[PDB]
């Protein structure tokens, strides 16, 4: 869609987090959610996990009325929404040095 553009200083190994969003239908929320996550498409792997599966019906078992769900680095960062607020806090400081 769009190349992006945004360059700064860093000087840091790159890996970006592995973001696990659990979307499903229907739901007019994991929808928007994805939409909220358009800016940090980029920003992070986005995992979209389907709890609409059967294989995945655990996911939904646990994460049916606390959905969309949000893993950042493999750890509930956020569910019911996308607080991206919350999302960028983590974004900035997640890894940390040497880490992983």
């Known amino acids: 869609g769009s190349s992006g553009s945004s360059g700064n200083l860093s000087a840091s190994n790159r890996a970006l987090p592995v973001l696990t969003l659990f979307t499903k239908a229907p739901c007019p929320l994991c929808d928007e959610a994805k939409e909220v996550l358009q800016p940090y498409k980029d920003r992070f792997?986005?995992?979209?996990?389907?709890?609409?599966?059967?294989?995945?019906?655990?996911?939904?078992?646990?994460?049916?009325?606390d959905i969309p769900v949000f893993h950042l680095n493999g750890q509930f960062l956020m569910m019911h929404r996308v607080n991206t607020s919350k999302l960028e806090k983590?974004?900035?400081?997640?890894?940390?040095?040497?880490?992983?």
């Open 90 to 100: 983590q974004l900035r400081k997640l890894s940390g040095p040497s880490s992983g």
């Open 45 to 65: 792997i986005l995992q979209e996990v389907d709890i609409t599966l059967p294989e995945n019906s655990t996911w939904y078992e646990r994460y049916k009325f």
